[PDB]
Design a protein around this ligand. Structure first.
Ligand code: HEC
Ligand code: HEC
Ligand code: HEC
Ligand code: HEC
Ligand code: HEC
Ligand SMILES: C/C=C(C)/C=C/C=C/C(OC)[C@@H](C)[C@H](OC)[C@@H](C)CCc1oc2c(O)c(OC)cc(OC)c2c(=O)c1C
Ligand SMILES: C/C=C(C)/C=C/C=C/C(OC)[C@@H](C)[C@H](OC)[C@@H](C)CCc1oc2c(O)c(OC)cc(OC)c2c(=O)c1C
Lengths: 93, 385, 53, 125, 245, 62, 385
């Protein structure tokens, strides 16, 4: 097999990141850890903190559109009803 | 060196499913990919097994499917699974694509990955249409008619391309028998397109939610994502199980239970749900040619993103205006589909057109403008010269 | 739990023990569901309408 | 988009007291709303690095700023994967949120601009 | 679109079978066959339902064999190639009333009665619509509604004008089990029957559904718990930095 | 901060009195997951295979 | 670095068909490889095109094939190409297998290569038989019958496997419709199996006629072997054209132009020419079970070759006793196929049995016995210690 073009990712041992020095990591065995807790008591008030931050970028747009739909849908329901049949003839063709 | 590493075949696997360096921080949105892979399998398998009972013939078509529905043991499970799998395929695909837009997966060096992805999107929509035709119910025949007729818009040869596809004077036996063959073929082409998609993904690795380099902290795909992909796999199955067994026809259209009829287009004719936003766009332009050109454009404009995105950082995680407008885009897409579902009546027409505008405007105006503005906002917000 | 240490003794469940158990389940589990289901729908089933004949 | 471009537009704003008093606040708020400081990251750590210019820059960066940046990035990933935010006191205080990589970027950019120009210079006899 | 064209929305009746745990009421299915055989069968085919499919669902092996044999079907010609008939058998499909379409429209003012094998699934509303359409025939069209000759008004059908008149009337059928054959009691029955005709897999399907949802649910929960265990090492992980001299 | 001064894991480190607890729970889960999956696999496989066996309409006893 | 090299997709194309180092001395037997690739394409393309007109329904099957011959434009060219392309596929496959069997390509590090190739042989024969059934002519029906029954030989579950395959009391509609379904599917698997054959080829490269290393003198695949291959491609098409246009049915059986009939096996029943040697081996064993075990064994025995060839040098180029015994095997194989086309009558039965013995005895006795002798012969002929 011949050589291929250079990329932005190597593989274990030469991943191609910056020389790391000074960073030290500690970790523990999953076997030696509390039989899966964290849920409730410690990370229940922590949960849902996300989408309490984001929920506005989601809500405002949803609101703008759901409102626009509803509103526009009622005007439809009206035009084709007995009452609006006079206005319907105006804006139709 | 280990066998899985040295062997010709196993090594391909090892470097794609076992030792593949993943960014420690990729979230569940990155699980969409494996799900699409599963859909392809489900679709392909359920399909081959039904082919063993299906008849391409325009006369026997609808009935053979009903034969699969009644006489074939577990037949209904195969059909309800194929049918609902297609719809789930699209739900998951849209999500996979959405994850792409949001996290800026399309830019960086991953362009080719994106472009191949778009091709797949086009190929899938095609495949599904061909398959939908095989049932040959009212929605089938008319969808077959309307869609093949999209090509009559081509200037001169246009009508020839159409009667050529049909292989006759209208949608008939030749058209269904051929569409079955094509429906069988394309999926394999998709699989093929999927490997290329994976190959491009494999040179630069997957991206992460921060939008920065992952190279500093990776964890092998195995004994991590194999188990994490499994969580969403099981959920995916559970939710599909619910439809396949307790709500098998909710995602479908009733008219597709009445055999096709060339002399009658139901007043209730309506496209499959996942095609609506597109159907909506075409309907908004009151000209034949433009409607079809604008629609195809709605798909192709996806290719323009790695260029209009003027940002100097990747992804929406730290951009405010971006997130907001991104969400204006998503819902606008849903509203667009909602429109395709309604009739061509006074309050809805103008709405469809505005929504269409917004859609195209997001890619050609919003993204380039906002991305520029946010770039400066970032600079002047901490620079003191 | 000490119930695991008696049965499997701190060793994961073996692949052979898994399959073996998998079979038992199939039959046991099924009959259970079938029963609960038939009972819940009593009076509607064919077995029931066939008796009133 | 180029930083030579960003820095052009930005400074002009930052200079005319009319645009300045009006934008800098929006910009400061935009940034605090962005939320990156809450992950212990400086904006320059966010700059997408998969291109010749950035690659050139990062290499030219003094050893210490590099190791530091390394840590910050890893820390960001660990925090994000745990779905929390760093303890408030570890957040990058706006005074630390310095454009440390920027000078290198601009240097590299203009250097490239020239090379580019000198490659196509026309001649006039 | 004017409500008259959309059609009056069918209400939600309480079907003995609406429910993830509910089976059809085979008692009602049986009565349904009768309402079909005596009233509907004179204009509507059931081409997709084979006799044998009733066996063990609504009737007995003997009862079906007997209903089948009352009709003649084409058999292989004899020694000299002369077409001859034969009494129906379990492997056959319920015979329609008309030999072809032209003949069906001749007997129906020009209209064509759809085959009712998939009717519940070929309409929005399903049981609720079929049932509502059957019962909701007002004795007289609303004021201003001019009706085409030979047509009948029914609010539930789209456009209000329907070529099928009203056919269900109190006590028109004599139920075998002694049930009061009121016009609505019948509608409830035929509809249920027509539902089984279109969805025979029904009971069997909801049962497998229950097995599937239970198992997959467990696999899902289990999988979450397993994922967390494997990921524990990475989740709790800690980093400390010391700027090198 | 010295590297010999190991951080605090007392929020996750289980107070042992039943050393093999994390293990007993994990292995049961894993094993239980395995049990149900073989069953589900056996079930899926049988469904497809049996969809080839003779259809209802062809078992016509002549 | 050049583009054809740097691109993720072209580098593959490049290292396989352009820069690939080949041994300068490889002869024209090395051209059979690409020919097979071509064959796979001809079959696949022609098939999909014909499929647009085919009806697997047992009552429509035979006639849809005639509809292709009589009504489809160039339909006959499509059919005759597919049918003859099927025979050429085997004439070439056999040559390709022979070349390797001769030059000891199954040896050294190329075993996995050879083993993959054996799978492709078993699969191709399967695909071919599935397709032969689709015409549903007399030969079709009875071929369908006999072959599926080969499994009724399995002791306990026997008959069950058989009726499972048929999907009925006998070979009827279910059988022919699932058989088309599968005839469409396997080709794509063969294709996959081919890419593995190629991956296994690519790590060691091709061998050469001298049977020694080609590392000292290499020449790129492009502009040499690309053009050398062209010569055989054309030559191949020229002969296939001679059959397709001037003698379309010579390679077939007339009985297949008579619609299949379940109550009458024609006294003229004979397997396809490429299956004959194997048919013959089965007929030569008067026991039902042993008959099928021996036949399947005759195919599996090829896997034994890398262990029974005790020679210390590769290939037959310099072995007098091997070249001799090789041709004895080749002709024996032809005689075997000849006995197959013959009747079960006195001189032929015994002949068939003697040849079957030889066939197996070649891989198990001759080769090891002969090669050991040649090793010693090579030694004593020049050692004067
Ligand atoms: C012939 C006189 C009929 C008898 C007796 C019954 N039906 Fe009928 N039906 C008939 C016609 C003319 C039509 C055509 C309606 C049209 O204008 O399209 C029908 C239609 C139906 C339908 C379809 C309604 C729709 O949405 O199009 C249903 C569900 C139906 N018929 C039910 C039904 C039942 C259950 C009957 C026995 C009680 C019955 N029909 C009798 C003609 C005739
Ligand atoms: C033969 C192989 C085969 C493959 C591979 C296949 N299908 Fe199908 N498909 C069928 C058959 C047979 C039918 C007709 C019967 C039916 O409706 O299920 C069908 C029908 C469909 C329908 C109609 C849905 C319905 O049942 O009303 C859709 C949509 C569809 N296929 C989508 C897909 C998609 C998307 C894929 C994935 C690429 C795919 N199919 C792959 C065989 C296949
Ligand atoms: C659907 C695609 C398709 C593929 C892919 C395909 N075939 Fe076929 N094949 C058919 C059809 C349709 C027929 C029936 C018409 C005919 O006889 O040509 C057929 C018939 C045949 C026949 C019968 C010969 C005859 O009497 O015409 C043979 C043998 C055959 N195929 C071999 C092959 C082989 C070998 C391959 C692959 C290497 C293959 N086919 C791939 C569709 C296909
Ligand atoms: C146009 C959108 C698009 C489509 C359509 C698409 N992909 Fe992707 N895919 C991408 C991009 C871009 C990425 C890189 C995402 C990232 O990690 O930032 C990607 C990544 C992936 C990944 C890795 C997991 C992940 O979600 O990041 C897999 C696996 C994958 N896709 C499979 C598929 C399959 C299978 C299909 C279709 C059958 C498909 N993709 C369709 C754009 C697409
Ligand atoms: C029973 C064995 C066997 C079968 C069947 C077989 N191959 Fe091969 N193939 C080989 C071996 C071994 C080699 C290496 C021979 C050498 O180059 O010395 C080879 C080499 C090749 C080559 C290189 C050119 C040449 O002829 O040496 C190609 C390409 C190839 N095979 C294609 C195929 C394709 C395509 C098929 C069928 C669809 C196929 N092979 C079936 C054994 C087989
Ligand atoms: C052999 C292959 C051939 C000939 C061509 C296939 C390729 C075509 C496509 O692209 C893949 C096509 C699916 C298109 O994409 C532009 C989709 C967005 C479809 C949009 C679409 O659907 C409809 C539909 O489903 C219907 O059903 C009831 C009815 C319809 O009218 C009312 C439509 C319709 O008006 C449109 C625009
Ligand atoms: C879905 C796939 C299924 C069910 C099974 C397929 C796999 C089986 C094979 O191997 C791949 C099989 C082709 C076999 O291999 C041992 C070949 C050498 C064929 C041997 C073969 O052919 C015959 C044939 O063609 C005939 O024509 C009319 C007639 C025949 O006697 C009357 C025979 C025959 O007596 C034999 C032994």
């Amino acid at each position: 097999g011949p050589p291929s073009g250079k990329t932005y990712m190597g593989w274990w041992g030469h991943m191609g990141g910056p020389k790391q020095k000074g960073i030290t990591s500690y970790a523990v065995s999953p076997y030696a850890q509390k039989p899966l807790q964290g849920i409730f008591h410690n990370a229940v008030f922590n949960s849902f903190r996300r989408f309490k931050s984001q929920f506005l970028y989601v809500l405002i747009p949803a609101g703008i559109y759901w409102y626009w739909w509803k509103n526009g849908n009622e005007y439809n329901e009206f035009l084709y009803s007995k009452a609006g049949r006079e206005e319907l003839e105006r804006v139709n063709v | 060196m280990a066998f899985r590493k040295s062997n010709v075949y196993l090594s391909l696997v090892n470097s794609y499913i076992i030792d593949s360096p993943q960014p420690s921080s990729i979230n569940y949105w990155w699980n969409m990919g494996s799900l699409l892979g599963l859909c392809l399998v489900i679709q392909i398998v359920t399909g081959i097994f039904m082919a063993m009972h299906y008849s391409s013939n325009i006369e026997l078509a609808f009935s053979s499917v009903e034969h699969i529905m009644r006489d074939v043991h577990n037949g209904y499970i195969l059909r309800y699974l194929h049918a609902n799998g297609a719809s789930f395929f699209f739900m998951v695909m849209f999500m996979h694509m959405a994850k792409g837009l949001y996290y800026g997966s399309y830019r960086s060096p991953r362009v080719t990955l994106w472009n191949v992805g778009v091709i797949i999107f086009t190929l899938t929509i095609a495949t599904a249409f061909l398959g939908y035709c095989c049932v040959y119910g009212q929605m089938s025949h008319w969808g077959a008619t309307v869609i093949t007729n999209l090509f009559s818009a081509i200037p001169f040869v246009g009508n020839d391309i159409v009667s050529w596809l049909w292989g006759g004077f209208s949608v008939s036996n030749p058209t269904i028998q051929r569409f079955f063959a094509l429906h069988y073929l394309v999926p394999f082409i998709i699989a093929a397109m999927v490997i290329m998609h994976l190959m491009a993904l494999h040179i630069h690795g997957s991206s992460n939610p921060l939008g920065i380099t992952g190279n500093l902290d990776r964890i092998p795909m195995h004994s991590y994502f194999i188990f994490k992909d499994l969580v969403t796999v099981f959920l995916f199955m559970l939710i599909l199980a619910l439809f396949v067994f307790y709500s098998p026809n909710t995602l479908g259209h009733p008219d597709n239970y009445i055999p096709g009829n060339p002399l009658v287009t139901p007043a209730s004719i309506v496209p499959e749900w996942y095609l609506l936003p597109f159907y909506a766009i075409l309907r908004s332009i009151p000209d034949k040619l433009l409607g079809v050109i604008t629609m195809f454009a709605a798909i192709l404009v996806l290719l323009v993103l790695p260029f209009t995105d003027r940002s100097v950082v990747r992804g929406n995680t730290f951009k405010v205006l971006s997130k907001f407008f991104f969400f204006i885009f998503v819902f606008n897409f849903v509203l667009l589909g909602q429109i395709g579902a309604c009739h061509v009546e006074v309050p809805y027409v103008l709405m469809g057109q505005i929504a269409t505008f917004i859609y195209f405007a997001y890619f050609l105006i919003i993204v380039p403008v906002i991305s520029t503005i946010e770039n400066v906002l970032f600079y002047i917000g901490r620079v003191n010269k | 739990s000490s119930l695991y240490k008696t049965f499997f003794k701190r060793n994961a469940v073996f692949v052979g023990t898994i399959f073996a158990g998998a079979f038992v389940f199939q039959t046991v589990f099924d009959t259970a569901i079938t029963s609960w289901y038939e009972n819940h729908n009593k009076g509607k089933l064919w077995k029931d309408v066939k008796a009133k004949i | 988009q180029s930083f030579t471009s960003i820095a052009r537009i930005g400074d002009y704003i930052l200079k005319s007291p009319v645009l300045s008093k009006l934008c800098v606040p929006v910009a400061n708020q935009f940034i605090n709303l962005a939320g990156y400081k809450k992950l212990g990251l400086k904006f320059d750590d966010l700059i997408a690095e998969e291109n010749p210019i950035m690659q050139t820059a990062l290499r030219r960066l003094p050893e210490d700023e590099s190791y530091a940046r390394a840590y910050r990035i890893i820390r960001a990933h660990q925090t994000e994967l745990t779905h929390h935010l760093l303890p408030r006191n570890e957040w990058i205080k706006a005074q630390e949120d310095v454009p440390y990589l920027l000078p290198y970027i601009l240097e590299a950019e203009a250097a490239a601009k020239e090379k580019d120009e000198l490659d196509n210079i026309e001649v006039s006899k | 679109m004017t409500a008259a064209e959309h059609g009056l929305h069918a209400p939600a009746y309480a079907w003995s079978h609406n429910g993830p745990f509910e089976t059809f009421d085979h008692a009602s299915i049986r009565r349904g066959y009768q309402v079909y055989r005596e009233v509907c069968a004179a204009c509507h085919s059931l081409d997709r339902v084979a006799w044998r499919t009733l066996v063990g669902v609504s009737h007995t092996n003997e009862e079906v064999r007997n209903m089948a044999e009352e009709f003649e079907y084409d058999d292989e010609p004899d020694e000299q190639g002369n077409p001859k008939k034969r009494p129906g058998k379990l492997s056959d499909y319920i015979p329609g009333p008309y030999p072809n379409e032209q003949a069906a429209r001749a007997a129906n003012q020009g209209a064509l009665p759809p085959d009712l094998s998939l009717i519940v699934k070929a309409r929005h509303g399903g049981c609720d619509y079929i049932f509502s359409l059957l019962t909701g025939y007002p004795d007289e069209p609303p004021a201003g509604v001019a009706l085409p000759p030979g047509s009948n008004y029914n609010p539930y059908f789209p456009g209000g004008s329907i070529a099928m008149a009203r056919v269900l009337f109190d006590d028109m059928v004599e139920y075998e089990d002694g049930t009061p054959a009121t016009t609505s009691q019948m509608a409830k029955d035929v509809t249920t029957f027509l539902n089984w005709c279109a969805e025979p897999e029904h009971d069997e399907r909801k049962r497998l559904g229950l097995k599937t949802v239970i198992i997959l649910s467990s696999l899902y929960l289990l999988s979450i718990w397993v994922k967390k265990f494997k990921w524990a090492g990475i989740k709790t992980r800690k980093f400390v930095f010391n700027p090198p001299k | 901060k010295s590297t010999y001064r190991t951080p605090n894991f007392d929020d996750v480190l289980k107070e042992n009195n039943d050393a093999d607890k994390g293990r007993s729970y994990a292995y049961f889960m894993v094993g239980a997951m395995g049990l149900l999956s073989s069953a589900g696999a056996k079930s899926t496989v049988e469904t497809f295979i049996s969809s080839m066996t003779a259809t209802a309409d062809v078992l016509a006893m002549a």
